[PDB]
Write a protein that binds this ligand. Structure first.
Ligand SMILES: NC(=O)c1ccc[n+]([C@@H]2O[C@H](COP(=O)([O-])OP(=O)(O)OC[C@H]3O[C@@H](n4cnc5c(N)ncnc54)[C@H](OP(=O)(O)O)[C@@H]3O)[C@@H](O)[C@H]2O)c1
Ligand SMILES: NC(=O)c1ccc[n+]([C@@H]2O[C@H](COP(=O)([O-])OP(=O)(O)OC[C@H]3O[C@@H](n4cnc5c(N)ncnc54)[C@H](OP(=O)(O)O)[C@@H]3O)[C@@H](O)[C@H]2O)c1
Ligand SMILES: NC(=O)c1ccc[n+]([C@@H]2O[C@H](COP(=O)([O-])OP(=O)(O)OC[C@H]3O[C@@H](n4cnc5c(N)ncnc54)[C@H](OP(=O)(O)O)[C@@H]3O)[C@@H](O)[C@H]2O)c1
Lengths: 559, 559, 562
């Protein structure tokens, strides 16, 4: 683009980083103050107004205003300290910010598609001004991680999710499109809220809902190609699994709340095997919770056990799940399709504490959002059954964790191998022993998986890709970090980890003939590197050249 | 315009006030949340976030963000209570906001032209995306009313000034262009400020400066027409008068700090004549100060005295001016071109207090920014020389006023006729007498003058136009308001007052053959009304029609 | 910028785009790999032009050239304005559209129909140019020499506007041709399957007048009250009524009435330099009493009054003959403007008898009757006065009152001749040679348009047409007059038009009709700077740097921040 419109284009606007030469060539000289700053100075300037804010919500506001006007500077900020800003642009801040302030974007960020637009979605896609779309993150806003049904305010979550695609993975932000599907909201606070900007009726459900999702997938892939990545985020439990089984083999589709969760949890389990010095086959798993996360983790664990050599039926029997009505056993009431797959041949047990005592698991995984469920008795039991028990308190936020890092290290007398979903500072026990517990962040998974899928036009995303991604993450951890109790690589290395994930995934796709991109690159690393988006400003070079003087003399006819 | 770009166009974007029908016709459906609000609801929504701000500066920030995205809603806010928002978008807030925060506009608002762009101004005008420009407000930022040399940060002042053109006058905002001329700054705080975004050298002066202003006037009128209104704002004293005498007869040009100040001050004097029941010829004026304001007021007073019948030389001798070195008398040192015009035949007098006693003025006008200069002795002297003395404490801000309204009413025992430049709440003396002092706001003048000039293509703005504007303002005051000590009409009536000013001015121009617009309208009020900009959203009607059925049958050829 | 410049005829230079301009505009690869001068382009197109051997075929090639490269189109036209004026305008344009319809492959103007009433402002927005300063409008009812061509009449404003630019230097991009289609009365068009206009008869009455009223209002609302609107080829009654209704309300004139009058009077004033007598010593007989006659006669009275003759005495010098005979007081079949020139005289039915009684010093044929200037009429003139004036203005050549040869032969070399149609040089049997001039309207309207547009003259009073006539009459050299030439050479039309623009501009500021300000001190330097040239424009980017030290202080990095 040229002229005034370039300053309103978030992908090309440099603000005062436009050189005088660039302003003149673009025909915008005089629209910008008479000062010429480097990007590094722009970073310093914006960071001063960043620290003056008294809340995380206000810092999210500042960053959204910056993303509105200068996308290159926005990702300069995010990548300068990814671990610091990830909790601001995404969870847990984005949900709290949208729940309190609504949507604060002053430039349209994506598409709002309602159930009442059924039959006209193709036309609505045409309102988005980018034609080269390769990744779509979509939500209906029914299960925002930690806050529930936010309805139309849930648009902030795909916006924040995609920011991490780019900041942590190097996915081209211009090829990304966040979509909000508004079928209504069941949040009584929103339906009586006079400032609510979504559909003020209860959620449409049943086939009429599925019809809209069907048209959405068809419309997106009709306009952008069947290779378009479509990631589902923050869908309720029943819809999440149904939609995944329906589309995962027909479209380029995955659900991060199920599959990304599974891979990073399995990654922590594999890293802990390097400490326990046993095989995955030697383990017995008890799940505190039996929803989206627990089902995803359990299914990927079985897939990993199968690769070690354990047949599927045998591997399934190593998994015990406790839901809100007790242990899931054959013949219990209140079971469903997913739950019957893991129903053990056992009498009814009501309490998690009793299940720990009966089955004596080598690892317990908490994904039920019940605070303190890993009691002192449970931790002490686990530390007496096995030398190095594995304690995953994955529920979010921190106030809903199954236990604290300090309580696990103290009660297990420093032998528990711990990981959480929420960040815990380093623990040092009375005896001097020091532990640095790791956080199982989904951003370890979905940025690199998306980069390799987009890079090679990987047509579908089978669960083998999430398994090999977990194996890759597990081997990122160094021996020193294992010595400290860290089961995950540092977040400051996330762009390197994602790039190595993208190459492994790309290599896997070509070997299974799943990649669409042609021809297959010989140097997969160089290929993926060439697609990584950098916060560095591009240059508006002109590409002027001349012809040989003799050729120009002969080709120019005068009198 | 159509498509995505309409949401980024501040003059067409309605936000959620776009009907579903409008979104579909524009091809933007899905870019806006699924809610359809009236402008009145938008006003309520934005006013809630307005009241939560703890400072005027933060409220200016909120309004600038709104002007960035929705100009119709912005002027809906301003016109809902003009008296309330005028101090926020313009003085005194705008100067304090820009001095502390810099420039906060996230959409280019005008043109920055530097001394180093000399010879290339025509090209720079082409960066502004509006071709139909009819009004330009320009500053070099050397004398920001109340804060001094703000350099490049002075861009906020023309932006705020033009907002009042539209809010108080109905001038079309899309035809308005604010310009900042950066020749440097002499503000030592800015030159050592690492965040300053202007030219970091002292101000260029002399002919090299005038050369740049010469090219600026030529470039603007070459591109937009010689009828383009060019108002100068916040120029230092020497430059202000020199530039005015140079351009006022060659271009459509005026300086509000000199001429708008003069007309509203003379307006207060004329309104006070309705209380004093004497002629302007019966008055003796003493000026506290002898700068831009005092010279402008004095020159217009002489022009008014001349119209009552007093010859120029005699009328001049009714004006006494005191500067920083005492009374201005023939043969004094430290006089200049303007000051010699009012030099009295009198010995040197050092103090204002002594001048009041010697000459016994009927009216004292304070424009020197010296706090408390109208002492208790001066007020008591004035109240003993004349029955109804006129006390104008015009210096800004309130802390620099020559006296308070309460001190004038108390010391003169309720007989002083008072006006100020800063707002004073109503005074009630011990004896029950109640006074509602008026504020001499320049916005009484420049919005209506600009509307009539723009409406009729008035080629030049002679001082007779500012005189008749003052006579119009004076007669706006009702008898009841005079009974209360109010010398100016209420600010809530400013759009009506400006419209009546615009008609009078337009009528004056056609009678003196100064108007360019052709043909002369018979109903001047209807003509000017048709040019008043309203905050009401326009409609994207399609204008579809058909031909007579028989005509279409005959004009359509098939097989 | 981009591919679209090659489709923009105002910017497209074809193979004259240098490599550097092609790369800069982002069009490299769209044009063959050769770079041509405009002079070479001119030579190539001229070769194609001469291989054609129809005037119609030469019109088509020039139109497709105008379709793609406007600067080159006008370089062709200006290289020999006399050669191409007949091809792009009268008489070829009328015959071209009559036979081929509209050959334009790029939209040239606006078609506004009676059925579009109430939406004319919307249709003006279809024209991609916003800065229009001259509009030529027709309804196609009286195409000069051909009659009612209906919607095929669009070719005439397009050809007319090309002469505004070629002879006058008016900016072509600021001009808009308009066809108002209210139907047609041509029975051959109404029955024609290929006809592209409204296939019903011409709407007349209030609905017609209201459409024209809206057109004037819509054009000036969008383009400004100063926008020149010139009416072309309307029928007689509409032409005069519309002229009287708008000439004081808008910037308006009718070239068939006023431009014709201007160039006819110019020829007469030039002829006074041969006859060496005052205009008040003359008696005029008009063959024809219609659009052209009334225009010329009214301007003749004006020039007689300026010479000082009372108006009633001046009007009495004019005798008019229509299709019923002499226009007397007390005849039947006499209209409005006809009573103004009726004479207290017995009825006379033949032009021959009128000439024998009145013994006029000048006869002017504007009736389109071939051979009306009989040998008897010519022989009578030459015996009544030593140098009689014979103006055979009817077009085309076949409908002229007499040929130049016949005038010079029968008048024994003493007749002063001018025609509307171009007659070649005449050499009589005794050896005497004459070079008869053509009273071309292009002598008048390009210079008047240029002066009016340059000054923002709000209205065009007939004094401007009179002073234009006086200017043209002074242009002719003394040598050319000795050879019978009453008009300057058509090759000088651009210079003549510039000089006319200056006088018109001088007149306008003296009587405060010019709205452009500031008034230019030097009227010619002012108009010169507005003449459009066929020179290709430059694509030079305005690039520059700030002084080194000033730029170093304004460039902030992480090292030099504090
Ligand atoms: N990488 C991460 O850190 C990560 C990722 C994803 C999710 N999580 C967290 O995992 C937790 C659950 O996520 P989700 O998506 O699976 O939610 P979900 O779909 O709603 O599933 C919730 C599960 O918890 C069960 N439950 C509720 N109360 C229980 C109780 N007293 N005892 C045992 N089970 C109980 C529920 O039983 P019923 O089936 O009977 O209702 C249900 O099975 C959340 O806190 C989430 O933040 C963490
Ligand atoms: N409608 C309004 O309310 C309105 C409009 C415009 C301005 N004002 C106010 O008027 C005041 C002056 O404005 P301006 O533009 O004229 O500023 P200015 O151009 O700088 O002139 C200041 C004048 O005050 C004189 N002065 C300074 N100290 C003095 C002292 N002790 N005694 C007497 N005179 C003294 C100065 O004398 P020297 O010449 O010797 O330096 C100078 O003549 C400001 O406060 C301004 O806010 C009000
Ligand atoms: N620059 C030029 O050389 C120039 C410019 C313009 C026009 N012309 C030519 O002037 C001629 C007329 O043009 P126009 O616009 O004036 O057309 P017009 O108004 O429609 O008709 C002109 C007159 O011809 C009269 N007429 C018809 N038959 C006649 C006859 N036997 N005897 C005497 N008069 C007769 C008609 O009389 P009625 O009223 O009774 O019907 C009518 O008044 C055309 O040939 C045109 O080409 C030349």
């Amino acid at each position: 683009k040229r002229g005034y419109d370039v300053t309103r284009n978030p992908h090309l606007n440099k603000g005062m980083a436009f050189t005088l030469e660039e302003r003149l060539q673009l025909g915008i000289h005089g629209l910008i103050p008479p000062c010429f700053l480097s990007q590094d100075v722009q970073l310093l300037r914006i960071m001063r107004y960043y620290e003056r804010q008294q809340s995380d919500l206000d810092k999210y506001i500042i960053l959204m205003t910056l993303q509105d006007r200068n996308e290159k500077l926005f990702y300069r900020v995010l990548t300068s300290d990814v671990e610091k800003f990830m909790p601001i642009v995404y969870t847990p801040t984005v949900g709290l910010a949208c729940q309190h302030y609504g949507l604060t974007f002053r430039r349209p960020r994506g598409l709002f598609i309602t159930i009442h637009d059924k039959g006209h979605l193709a036309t609505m896609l045409n309102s988005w001004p980018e034609d080269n779309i390769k990744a779509v993150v979509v939500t209906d806003g029914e299960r925002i991680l930690g806050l529930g049904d936010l309805g139309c305010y849930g648009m902030g979550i795909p916006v924040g999710k995609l920011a991490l695609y780019t900041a942590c993975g190097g996915v081209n932000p211009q090829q990304c499109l966040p979509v909000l599907l508004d079928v209504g909201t069941n949040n009584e606070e929103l339906l009586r809220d006079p400032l609510y900007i979504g559909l003020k009726h209860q959620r449409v459900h049943g086939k009429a809902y599925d019809d809209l999702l069907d048209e959405f997938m068809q419309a997106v892939t009709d306009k952008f190609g069947i290779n378009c990545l479509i990631q589902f985020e923050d869908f309720a439990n029943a819809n999440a699994f149904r939609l995944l089984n329906k589309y995962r083999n027909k479209y380029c589709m995955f659900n991060d709340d199920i599959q990304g969760t599974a891979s990073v949890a399995v990654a922590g389990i594999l890293a802990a095997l390097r400490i326990t010095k046993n095989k995955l086959s030697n383990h017995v798993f008890v799940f505190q919770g039996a929803g989206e996360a627990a089902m995803g983790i359990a299914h990927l664990l079985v897939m990993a056990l199968e690769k070690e050599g354990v047949p599927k039926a045998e591997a399934t029997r190593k998994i015990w799940m406790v839901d809100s009505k007790g242990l899931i056993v054959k013949g219990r009431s209140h079971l469903n399709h997913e739950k019957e797959m893991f129903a053990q041949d056992h009498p009814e047990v009501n309490s998690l504490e009793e299940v720990v005592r009966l089955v004596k698991p080598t690892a317990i995984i908490g994904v039920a959002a019940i605070a303190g469920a890993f009691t002192e008795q449970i931790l002490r039991d686990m530390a007496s059954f096995h030398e190095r028990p594995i304690i995953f308190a994955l529920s979010n936020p921190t106030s809903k964790a199954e236990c604290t890092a300090e309580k696990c290290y103290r009660v297990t007398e420093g032998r528990g191998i711990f990981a959480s979903g929420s960040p815990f500072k380093s623990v040092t026990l009375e005896d001097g022993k020091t532990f640095i517990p790791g956080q199982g962040n989904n951003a370890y998974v979905f940025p690199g998986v998306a980069l390799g899928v987009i890079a090679g036009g990987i047509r579908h995303i089978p669960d083998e890709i999430f398994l090999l991604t977990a194996e890759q993450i597990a081997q990122e951890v160094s021996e020193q970090h294992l010595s400290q109790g860290r089961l995950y690589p540092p977040l400051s290395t996330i762009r390197d980890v994602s790039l190595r994930i993208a190459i492994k995934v790309l290599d896997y796709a070509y070997k299974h003939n799943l990649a669409s991109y042609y021809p297959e690159p010989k140097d997969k690393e160089a290929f993926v590197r060439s697609l990584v988006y950098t916060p560095d400003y591009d240059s508006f070079t002109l590409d002027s050249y001349t012809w040989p003087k003799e050729a120009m003399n002969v080709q120019t006819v005068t009198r």
